[PDB]
Amino acid sequence: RWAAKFYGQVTFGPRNYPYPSSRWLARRFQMKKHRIIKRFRFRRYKLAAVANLPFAKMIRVGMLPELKSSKTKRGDVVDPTLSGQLVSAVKNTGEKRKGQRTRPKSKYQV
Amino acid sequence: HRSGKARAFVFRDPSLRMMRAGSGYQQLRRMGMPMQVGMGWR
């Protein structure tokens, strides 16, 4: 998987604690994870990794001038051809074409 | 404490601590292993 399973160290209890995490701690970190994920959803984050490019450095598409949510902040500078192609990708991801495999949809994906 | 240093159950036999030290850096300097390539002490 790409994303992080956890945020922070969710298994901190004393040694030989016979579970990965306690209820208390896991609830704290569930809170923090919740906040981060909710932030991702509402700000409408989009990331991309393109072939024949450094992968660890991911173009943030949610900041691109066309797809940018804010009306104010200066978004990002990405190549004109590449950015056109990214816009087309994000756009044609949205809806289910029959014969293609059903993939989860959301409001915040648009 | 899953996040923290490993502790021994008991101490270590000091005698063994001194036996494992035979080839240590000080003994080597005394044997003359390292080449003297510079002026050193005056």
């Binding site: 922070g8 004393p14 040694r15 030989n16 016979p18 704290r28 | 502790r7 159950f9």
Partner: peptide
């Protein structure tokens, strides 16, 4: 996370497995 303990909770129990983990 909150950097302090919001609850004052002291369990007095000392299970032998928690303490000496070298042997259990």
């Amino acid at each position: 996370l909150k950097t302090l303990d919001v609850r004052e909770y002291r369990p007095l129990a000392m299970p032998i497995e928690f303490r000496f983990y070298q042997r259990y």
